[PDB]
Design a protein around this motif. Structure first.
Motif, short mmCIF file in Angstrom:
data_model
loop_
_atom_site.label_atom_id
_atom_site.label_comp_id
_atom_site.label_asym_id
_atom_site.label_seq_id
_atom_site.Cartn_x
_atom_site.Cartn_y
_atom_site.Cartn_z
N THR B 31 0.99 -1.39 0.02
CA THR B 31 0.01 0.05 0.02
C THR B 31 0.97 1.30 0.02
O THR B 31 1.90 1.37 0.78
CB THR B 31 -0.93 0.07 1.21
N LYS B 32 0.66 2.24 -1.00
CA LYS B 32 1.45 3.12 -1.17
C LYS B 32 1.25 4.25 -0.03
O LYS B 32 -0.18 4.91 -0.24
CB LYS B 32 1.38 3.61 -2.51
N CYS B 33 1.80 4.56 0.76
CA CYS B 33 1.46 5.77 1.81
C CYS B 33 2.84 6.99 1.42
O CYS B 33 3.78 7.12 2.10
CB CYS B 33 1.83 5.34 3.15
N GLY B 34 2.44 7.40 0.22
CA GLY B 34 3.66 8.28 -0.12
C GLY B 34 5.09 7.92 -0.39
O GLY B 34 5.20 7.01 -1.12
N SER B 35 5.91 8.34 0.35
CA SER B 35 7.33 8.03 0.17
C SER B 35 7.52 6.46 0.81
O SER B 35 8.76 6.08 0.55
CB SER B 35 8.20 9.00 0.94
N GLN B 184 10.60 4.15 -4.63
CA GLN B 184 11.35 4.68 -5.65
C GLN B 184 10.88 6.24 -6.05
O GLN B 184 11.92 7.09 -6.25
CB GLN B 184 11.34 3.66 -6.99
N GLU B 185 9.75 6.37 -6.32
CA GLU B 185 9.23 7.73 -6.59
C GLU B 185 7.77 7.80 -5.99
O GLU B 185 7.32 6.67 -5.51
CB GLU B 185 9.22 7.99 -7.84
N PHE C 90 11.75 18.19 4.61
CA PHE C 90 10.55 17.72 3.80
C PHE C 90 11.27 17.18 2.60
O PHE C 90 12.39 17.75 2.10
CB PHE C 90 9.64 18.73 3.60
N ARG C 91 10.40 16.27 1.88
CA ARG C 91 11.42 15.23 0.80
C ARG C 91 11.01 16.27 -0.46
O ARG C 91 10.11 16.76 -0.75
CB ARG C 91 10.52 14.03 0.52
N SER C 92 12.14 16.21 -1.38
CA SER C 92 11.90 16.43 -2.71
C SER C 92 12.75 15.56 -3.51
O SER C 92 13.89 15.39 -3.58
CB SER C 92 12.44 17.84 -3.12
ZN LIG Z 1 5.61 8.17 -4.70
#
Ligand SMILES: [Zn+2]
Ligand SMILES: CO[C@]1(C(=O)O)C[C@H](OC(C)=O)[C@@H](NC(C)=O)[C@H]([C@H](O)[C@H](O)CO)O1
Ligand SMILES: CO[C@]1(C(=O)O)C[C@H](OC(C)=O)[C@@H](NC(C)=O)[C@H]([C@H](O)[C@H](O)CO)O1
Ligand SMILES: CO[C@]1(C(=O)O)C[C@H](OC(C)=O)[C@@H](NC(C)=O)[C@H]([C@H](O)[C@H](O)CO)O1
Ligand SMILES: [Cl-]
Ligand SMILES: [Zn+2]
Ligand SMILES: [Zn+2]
Ligand SMILES: [Zn+2]
Ligand SMILES: [Zn+2]
Lengths: 172, 185, 186
Positions: B31-35, B184-185, C90-92
């Motif tokens: 489950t993708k929780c952002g990063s 990864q992204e 914060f991330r970039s």
């Molecule tokens: Zn992402």
């Protein structure tokens, strides 16, 4: 309506062996198809408040049950009191454990269980096991059951735990 | 149509080949929780050499590995132990109807977890957990998850299951374990 | 990109942390906000100094150390943390946003759930324990003890205590990764 929780203080909300003898802290956050769960327990009075297995070696476990109806609402026969279970600022099917992943009773598969270790009083040589089981109670549409148990001989140890995180698959 | 979850579906239909074709069901939910990817895993071995563990007869059979190999688009490669038919974005309790074309947002981050060609291999590309066979608390087995350490692919998730106790006629079907990793992204 | 839901160290291997010598370690810490809970992922690579190569035959007393992150009322990292401020943002993409953040209260450990130290009863729910493995070897465990809001001189804190009980001989202190969560202040 992304977090369902108990309030994070230490006021009693739960009945294990006598009324309001414990404070369960349970935070459920919906991350899409999975619920991220964070749990800890303080027993404040009664049978399980102070553990002494020197004098009572057979007192080694207890269970807290959360039972839910078809709309995901907590039932009154749960150990946790309904007045203490709310969304953070009542239907909640999206927080319920998935019935295909974790089917209701009737030999079943162990993937409806998660085990973790927490520590009494925060002491690293005082482990206890938290066993969490999904949808294995009757008389409800969904359930989450916490079994606390221990195998060391504890001598007058107050039952208040460190925190444990797990996740489970959501019904929708 | 949950575009934030890649999964195997939660049924018990075998989808994985460890020692013989379709001898296990790997239940894996990403489950993708952002990063971060939040991951939930369990295993049911239904047939073959690892279905019943008996270390009285074969004391050296103490581990096995399941590999998920992904190409540059995050698509599962056919030499993975997991079958491709079963691995897709979630729709209800099933999958979306067409096989996905891109899932880079679910892949393990290559800076956090570099490929084996890297100068130095770092232990942070590993997560350890313990699960319990048959749900019994005295039947632990170790699940070791490693990111991006296979060759012949752009990304990979490898599960190694092992145990150190002498089990006698113990069925290999596990409790569930949750972990996360950097996307990864 | 500009990921406002992730506060992190970035995932590279550039040392950013001081345990015993300046910049002797890389703490990789990712805090991802999932509403009221923070999903946290942590690992440690020690590259130099007294905790880099553990030998308890020669140094039997070297068995633990602590890494502290201390925050002010706005959730900004304080300069006496072990983690350097330049690296925490914060991330970039795989890096950080260009300007230092001014507020991160939504990532701080909740003060009701994890109260500051006092003279009253201290409760264990502000601790999470996990086990990580040095060099990724299953017979080289070390305990990671994470504690919320128990430092003084700050509004919030996260501390990581690493300890072990086996007698290790020339073991490089690089850990596997551990995930936990905690209740967020807002
Ligand atoms: Zn992402
Ligand atoms: C002897 O074995 C145990 C114990 O005391 O029972 C196991 C326990 O781990 C588990 C999973 O129970 C572990 N505690 C933690 C937090 O990992 C402790 C600890 O290493 C030492 O007591 C030194 O503090 O050792
Ligand atoms: C003796 O040590 C073990 C074991 O049986 O192998 C370790 C195991 O924990 C790990 C991490 O493998 C633990 N199980 C759980 C669920 O924590 C059991 C359990 O405490 C006892 O069997 C009593 O039920 O004890
Ligand atoms: C003897 O006890 C330990 C050890 O070596 O210290 C405990 C350790 O688990 C903990 C929680 O420290 C465990 N490692 C894992 C990854 O579970 C190893 C492992 O089972 C064997 O070494 C076989 O590889 O056994
Ligand atoms: Cl008390
Ligand atoms: Zn008391
Ligand atoms: Zn069989
Ligand atoms: Zn079976
Ligand atoms: Zn080194």
């Amino acid at each position: 309506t992304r977090t369902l929780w108990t309030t994070p203080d230490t006021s009693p909300n739960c009945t294990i062996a006598q009324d309001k003898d414990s404070k369960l802290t349970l935070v459920l956050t919906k991350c899409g198809s999975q619920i991220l769960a964070n749990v800890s327990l303080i027993v404040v009075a009664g049978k399980y408040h102070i553990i002494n297995n020197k004098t009572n070696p057979k007192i080694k476990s207890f269970t807290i049950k959360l039972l839910f109806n078809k709309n995901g609402v907590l039932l009154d026969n749960s150990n946790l009191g309904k007045a203490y279970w709310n969304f953070r600022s009542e239907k909640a099917i999206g927080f319920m454990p998935n019935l295909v992943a974790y089917p209701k009773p009737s030999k079943k598969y162990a993937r409806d269980i998660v085990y973790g270790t927490i520590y009494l009083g925060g002491k690293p040589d005082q482990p206890a096991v938290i066993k969490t089981t999904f949808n294995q109670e009757t008389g409800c549409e969904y359930s989450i059951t916490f079994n606390f148990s221990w195998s060391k001989t504890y001598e007058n140890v107050e039952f208040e735990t460190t925190s444990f995180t797990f996740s489970y698959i959501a019904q929708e």
